[PDB]
Amino acid sequence: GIGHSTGNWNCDTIWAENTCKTYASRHCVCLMRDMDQYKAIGNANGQHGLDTENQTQYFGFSTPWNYIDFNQYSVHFSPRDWQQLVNNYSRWRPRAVHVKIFNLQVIQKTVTDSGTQYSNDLTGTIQIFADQEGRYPRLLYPNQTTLMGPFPSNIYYLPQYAYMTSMFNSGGPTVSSWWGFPTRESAFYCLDESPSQMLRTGNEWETTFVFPSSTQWCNNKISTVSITQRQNPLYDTWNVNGRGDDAKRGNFCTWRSPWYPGPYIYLTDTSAASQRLENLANVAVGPDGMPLAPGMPQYRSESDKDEYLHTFWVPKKVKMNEGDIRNAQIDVSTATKVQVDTSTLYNTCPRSGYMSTVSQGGAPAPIVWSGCVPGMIWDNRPATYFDPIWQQFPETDEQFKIISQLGGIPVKESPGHIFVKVTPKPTGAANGLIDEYCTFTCTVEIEWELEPLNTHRWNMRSMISYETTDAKAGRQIVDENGQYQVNVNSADITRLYMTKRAPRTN
Amino acid sequence: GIGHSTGNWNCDTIWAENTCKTYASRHCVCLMRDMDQYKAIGNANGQHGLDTENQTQYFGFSTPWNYIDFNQYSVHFSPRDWQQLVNNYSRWRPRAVHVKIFNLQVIQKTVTDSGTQYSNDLTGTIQIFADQEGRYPRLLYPNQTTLMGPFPSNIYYLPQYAYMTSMFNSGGPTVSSWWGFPTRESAFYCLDESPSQMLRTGNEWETTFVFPSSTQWCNNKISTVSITQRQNPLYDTWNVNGRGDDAKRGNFCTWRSPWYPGPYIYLTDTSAASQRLENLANVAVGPDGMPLAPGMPQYRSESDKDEYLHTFWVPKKVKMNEGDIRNAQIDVSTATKVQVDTSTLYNTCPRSGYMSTVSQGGAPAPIVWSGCVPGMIWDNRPATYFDPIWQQFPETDEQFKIISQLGGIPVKESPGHIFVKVTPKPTGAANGLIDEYCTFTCTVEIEWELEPLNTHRWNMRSMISYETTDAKAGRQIVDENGQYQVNVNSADITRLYMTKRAPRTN
Amino acid sequence: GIGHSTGNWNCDTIWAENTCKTYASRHCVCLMRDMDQYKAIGNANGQHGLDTENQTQYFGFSTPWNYIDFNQYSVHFSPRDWQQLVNNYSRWRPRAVHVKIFNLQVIQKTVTDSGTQYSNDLTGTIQIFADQEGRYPRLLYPNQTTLMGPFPSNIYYLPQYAYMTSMFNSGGPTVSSWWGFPTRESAFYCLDESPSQMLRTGNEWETTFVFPSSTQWCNNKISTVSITQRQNPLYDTWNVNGRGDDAKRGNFCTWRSPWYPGPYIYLTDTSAASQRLENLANVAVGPDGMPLAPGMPQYRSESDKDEYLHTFWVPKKVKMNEGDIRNAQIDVSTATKVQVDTSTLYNTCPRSGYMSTVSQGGAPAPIVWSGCVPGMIWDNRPATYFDPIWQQFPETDEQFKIISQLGGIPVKESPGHIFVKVTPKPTGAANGLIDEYCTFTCTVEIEWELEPLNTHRWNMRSMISYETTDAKAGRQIVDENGQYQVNVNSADITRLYMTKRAPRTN
Amino acid sequence: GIGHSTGNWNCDTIWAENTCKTYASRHCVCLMRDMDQYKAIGNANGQHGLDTENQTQYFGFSTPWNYIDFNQYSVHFSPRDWQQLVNNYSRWRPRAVHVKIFNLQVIQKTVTDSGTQYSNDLTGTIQIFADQEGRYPRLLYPNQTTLMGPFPSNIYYLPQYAYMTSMFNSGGPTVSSWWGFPTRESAFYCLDESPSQMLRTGNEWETTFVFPSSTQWCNNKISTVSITQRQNPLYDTWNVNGRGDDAKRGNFCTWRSPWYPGPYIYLTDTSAASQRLENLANVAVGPDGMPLAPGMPQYRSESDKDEYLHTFWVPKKVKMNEGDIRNAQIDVSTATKVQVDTSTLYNTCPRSGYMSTVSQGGAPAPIVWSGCVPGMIWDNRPATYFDPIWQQFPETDEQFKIISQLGGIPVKESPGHIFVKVTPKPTGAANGLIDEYCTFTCTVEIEWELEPLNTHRWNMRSMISYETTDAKAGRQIVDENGQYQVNVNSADITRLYMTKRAPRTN
Ligand SMILES: [Mg+2]
Ligand SMILES: [Mg+2]
Ligand SMILES: [Mg+2]
Ligand SMILES: [Mg+2]
Ligand SMILES: [Mg+2]
Ligand SMILES: [Mg+2]
Ligand SMILES: [Mg+2]
Ligand SMILES: [Mg+2]
């Protein structure tokens, strides 16, 4: 009946030898969206202006549905879980994802002369279905504010599910209306067409996703030797140097290499005002295009250059109940700009671009774009505790070495969206519904496959170490006001939240 | 006891239908290294000057241990073995590697008023362990002087095992000390930490390595038709020419191609004095960088251009007992500079760079870097009898089409180093050891998987043929002084030692 | 469903021969704490001023969770239960602790123009977990106001769980901020990370703790002979007196003793105003320190000296519903200062300090600190009905004869905290929750192992006896206003509530 | 026969879940001692002068025998082994000790006009016996130079076994002869009276010791809360403050404590010249006495005060072959004075001495000696990588809480000495022996029982982390000269080599 709990809270992380199982429980608010209406959404302005909102053209639909987005490490791992993971394991990948929705409460809001009264709707339902068929558009973009909070007691407002569809603008960037955008390929999806479980309070819901065995790993390995220095220092080579002459002793950089470092793309960083996407390094795709930053993983000496480094905001502090952040922009003052530095890429990755000329005898010049040629080896950018766990990629005919420089394990199969909405309860009058929302507990269980790191080096290795400065800074703890304070800067991510800690000998 | 041999000499090559088994026996000297001390080694100078020694910065360790390096074809194949291999087989790969160490003799050297006396230390031991776990740094660089000699009676001095580790120079290229180089990732490896067999005379040792079935093949196939000429000459095509017009009869080069040749990188060759790595076509990686030569396999008409051709020294003659060559540079006058020409790449490989412009209607210009695009097909550089058999690559997150332009079958798993050192026998006094070294016989057995070549062409095919000029030049024979004389020039490698002899019909 | 009770009220005490089982049922209020937020708490002022609040520096966290603290005798025993226990048994210890939580009611509070309305939230949950792993900080301090009331009908407000963590102050006692205090060892604990049962009304919860068999006993034995007088009075000894001379008849104090009394520490009592911890007998530990009172158990003739006597407040009266006492100081006028006198220690314990000199022939002087030397025997301070049952001690490397002079059976394993919180029910708006709290019945069952006292003395023994003065004083009964009135003074504890009643013959 | 090795080199460390097995192999030199003579040894001077040699009086015997001393962590663990141990495990203890002696070589030294010639004595024997019965005096003193070197390739010269016996000096400290010292209790032990294995080359020897299950653990736990702060910060206590008054809110230091910190002894540090033992804090025992430093474990703010901190020399660098160090004093310039700081004792240990007075109302004064009183809890000093593994204590009637402030797990049963000597081979002439010594390989295998650390704190914990400064300093690596360079200072031991890293929650 209505008096028995349908599930239990678990945020724990359970470590086994080669596996860990993470539990993420959140108290979840499912708000009714747009009076249970699908709405066509769009933006007519295509000027692609940086620093100014609504400059890309799109056509899409916001659904009345909400969905659950747990894809980040900070959701499923406590900071010491992350410390244990990155310090002790050379790689890891998610295996099974189990999501439970339980302890449903549909709450009727009623407005009275005094405040809003909250009453249980005992027979109220919510509708839940997991879309694992790819029946509906997947929202692929990482680290969007749709995510659960890192802290267990963060109230999670399920984001409203909305998607963009194929548009075509015959007009310019300044077109006033976006109703010229829809194309015959533009697809409206009614999620109400899908079969969905209806749940009263006392009903529970669960779904399982299993990652394929082909799922790639998040690699924690760092190379302890330059790929250029793999020769024996005490011996000459029969190979010649770069220009074909004698390879000198102890001058190894001049020796011809059996391999190349990874590809390299020169990217620019502009500080100027009123710059468009076309002022950045970019490529035009479909309606708009994309910038090329951060680009190919490459060692950078500097801690701040944002065009070559994966750069993202992390919230300084996290309020427990932030409310619904739909259509809300992250306040700049509440976050910090952090850049994941490539210092861990020093041994395996190009420090500069490939330098060559077509002119015979000409001085080698930097090559804007060096695509993958046979014999390239490179390491990926380090993951962070704030990165997505996986990155689903769009279905295309052809992929090459799929990786997101933004983060996540590139996957061709990922947990589908779990769509939730409060069943509309109409008042019997036109254009009206009984005001109500759902609260429930969602536990996300992730099976993790771990590979413990193995190093026979004599000397000690670096570890992620929580320090007194970290505690005085208030990292990974709550403040006096109840806010879980991340308090992260780029140097803090190097020292705490980066992967590629595990020294690799080969 | 001490009076029975622990093994037998075998240098033979045994041919089966799809397999050959090579035996390489060498009389092996294991010298004590640095009084059984691990030493930190390094070079402070980073100016990367070509033509001048000690211009790359490195930090590493020389171990007291010695290791066995057999990775070259000339070690395991006689010249006629190579002739039989390259003439009769379209491809080959190593399968199992078996190494025997037997007939150990620990020899005590004692200095007397008259000369040095040599006595057996009958209870002296050597320590041997194969590192197949990748526990210790692998020395990946091909054709380093650590190799066994091509001739069976060459005395093989086991090279001292030394490696370079991650360094970081905050200073410039001119820094005086290399003790600023070590980093927290820099790993000292004590090989004495590994379990190792101790062997007296009368003990034998063996290890087996099996290449994975995923091991790539050394390909002996040459294309007998240009990839551009694969159309039927007698018929028109419905396809258009390059600019979209009628495809004319018997003008096939102008027809649009179903495929592209391989990637192309323009490289420069500089003859100037006092040139650094940065004057060559190159890329910066970690502490130093690498030159880009020879680059992508591409047909070259000329016999000598060293920047596009795999170029290496081959010794003119090989002394049977050369002594320990540790820290010795190959004498320029004792070797010859040979360049493996790409004439066998004529049909499958780009003869020039890709020629295109961004400017509409502009004249096509050479493209410095053409990375792999979908639809590229190409052939690898031909292997030589003097190439490594395999090339292990560094462990990285990501590889693309691993190949060494220097040679060898690119492998992700290769025989690990077999480490050998004389057990230190101390005198009972500080800083002193009984002077002693080990002689033993090492047999390296390699199983080879062969694919016999199949050609139905009516006319005869080219063969590697030993000629009277080869005999008068003294190739593949000893001279009057007992030196096995290779006497090779670039033309000699084309005619004798190159692969890609097997005509491929498709 | 919601219409069936999940448990029954039991406060009874059931006596068996060697065992009693106590039941403590309380009507329990679980209040939501700090809007379900973990808050960092601390005090910056370290002046350690007596008589003034907030003079110790600490850093810690208050959790949204509540916990159950039943550790006191007056909770589990009625006064006659205590009378029966102390009169009839030489010792007792707790064996099993069983806690039931049942008849849950989540009550929504709503504010209206007229008063606050209280409605059942029928699907509301609370979260409960017992932490028996020591996963979370145990609150070790005895007789803190977190306790249940002595009387069955006392409404028990579960205390908010909060803990202090390692701090380090580089500043002085006057530092303005406590955010300098956290250290790398300072640990924030999220109790929401633990798996916890969610319970609706109609769910019940229970946990069991079993004390180890190694659990010490609360000893009710008093010695009926001085440890100094254990000789036969009618006979001389061959032993000498204290200075080595003849041991005289009937002068036994001068005879050398086979044993010593317990250790002795001189403590001071200061009445002066504006005294700090450093004016008291004390020791500095970590951030602050501790006073040394009451110190080692020692006979005191006087009824009031608080530095040598276990001293604590007992409430004069106990209101049935006192409300939530979080952050509330006991009102001085509502309690009485009672001192447990050591009169029962007269025979076994030092009446003064050890008196000796280093100077040969010098007059013996009192020794400030006499630590345990071989041959010391002593009795513990008597327990009271108002003492804790057990005292858990902090985990340390080394313990010596663990005992709390404050009370309780020293234990290395005790019932863990049972953490309870109302599941936050959000309003769907930022920073807000439906105002609600839980009422439930908690029964604490304790198995007690008893040892009946055995005395063969001819004459009667003293007993705890309720007297007409006790009834006229209103002890152990309610007053006319419904308050359960303890009405205890030091003399009242000697006569009624002390242990060590059981005469021990040996 | 003589041509087969009797064992294999293993220095490896093998980690299992709850166990690790360490292998320590050393090349071991057994030198003939004193021409196979037992000699009476002694020192007549008893002035106990600090800073001057031979100031203690002793009588004893040096035996012709050598023994094996492996008792230190740095012998059996590589630095990363130590890092893995201290970072991942809350405690550890040794379980079984297995010692192998194999690959024996008896070497005859012969003097010739040119140098010394070294020849195998093939039929030469050494004598080995393990004394596990306690038949012979155990050398109990920790960290004496008799130890094996930390690095695997350190040549280990077995120390000559010598012991001191009961002496009594009726004279003064200035007596000229020590032949007055022997007493009827003074015991000469002939180790040649024991049965011992004789081994030729081709014989191997092994012994096993199993630690009792009662063996204590090396504790890696640090407390994350002060033992003074274990109360709930949000609640008042019924307990009174130190002087018996109201316990104020947030002033916890003034509350009476359920426990005391550990014992405290005030120690002095004198810098003056020509000071004797009697100028230091000390106690006279038997012939001489002992100083009291470092004393009871107590938190010290300062990094350098040597009287309260465990203080010892660590060698800056370690030569591989140092020769025989018998009767050799550590060169001051070759070591560093390091002090293990008590910062990890901050929460559990007294920061100052107990402060009290006998005078009523008198100001509390520091108490020179506070011995253990009931209710004391404390933590031990942290172990270091350079500490002994165990400390055997002398057999006595009575022990109290045996611990060495110098280090090691206090044990009543430890591996006995393995005594080795070269069998004297006489020349057939009076007072002469064929000059010979033995080299052999000794492997010491230790089974370790591990307890993995378990912490549920939300935030990260501190870790031992090898840093770039550590690598630039050359720690845990060899230098360019082949010396294994420890390069340790007090701050380096805090950060790298100390135990008590594992945060303990309770
Ligand atoms: Mg050239
Ligand atoms: Mg050279
Ligand atoms: Mg055209
Ligand atoms: Mg045509
Ligand atoms: Mg006398
Ligand atoms: Mg008498
Ligand atoms: Mg007082
Ligand atoms: Mg108070």
Numbering used by the authors:
A (entry chain A), B (entry chain G), C (entry chain E), D (entry chain F): 30 to 535
Published text:
Parvoviruses are linear single-stranded DNA (ssDNA) viruses with T = 1 icosahedral symmetry capsids, affecting both vertebrate and invertebrate hosts. To expand the architectural repertoire for the parvoviruses, two aveparvoviruses affecting red-crowned cranes (RCPV) or turkeys (TuPV) were selected for structural determination via cryo-EM representing two species of the genus with ~55% amino acid sequence identity comparing the VP2. The VP monomer for both aveparvoviruses retained the basic capsid architecture with the conserved eight-stranded jelly roll motif (βB–βI), which is extended by the additional βA-strand and one alpha helix (αA). Like other parvovirus capsids, the surface loops are dominated by the large GH loop, located primarily at the threefold region; the DE loop, which forms the fivefold channel pore; and the BC and EF loops, found at the two-/fivefold wall.
In the 1980s, ChPV and TuPV were identified to infect juvenile chickens and turkeys, respectively, and as potential causative agents of enteric disorders, affecting growth rates in poultry worldwide. Following cryo-EM data collection, three-dimensional reconstructions of both aveparvoviruses, utilizing 405,850 RCPV and 35,131 TuPV extracted individual particles, were determined at resolutions of 2.66 Å and 2.35 Å, respectively. The short threefold protrusions of the RCPV and TuPV capsids are primarily formed by VR-IV and VR-VIII. The VR-VIII loop of TuPV contains an insertion of a single amino acid relative to RCPV, whereas the VR-V loops have identical lengths in either virus. When superposed, the surface loops of these aveparvoviruses are nearly perfectly overlaid, with only minor differences in most surface loops, with the exception of VR-III where both ChPV and TuPV adopt a different loop conformation than RCPV due to a 2 aa insertion. With the technological advancements in recent years, cryo-EM is capable of generating high-resolution maps of macromolecules that allow us to discern fine structural details, such as water molecules or bound metal ions. Both RCPV and TuPV maps had conserved additionally ordered densities in the threefold region of the capsid, which represented potential metal-bivalent cation-binding sites (most likely Mg2+ or Ca2+) with ordered water molecules. The bivalent cation at the side of the threefold protrusion is coordinated by identical amino acids in RCPV and TuPV, including D262, T263, D272, and A273 (RCPV numbering) of VR-IV and Q355 of VR-VII.
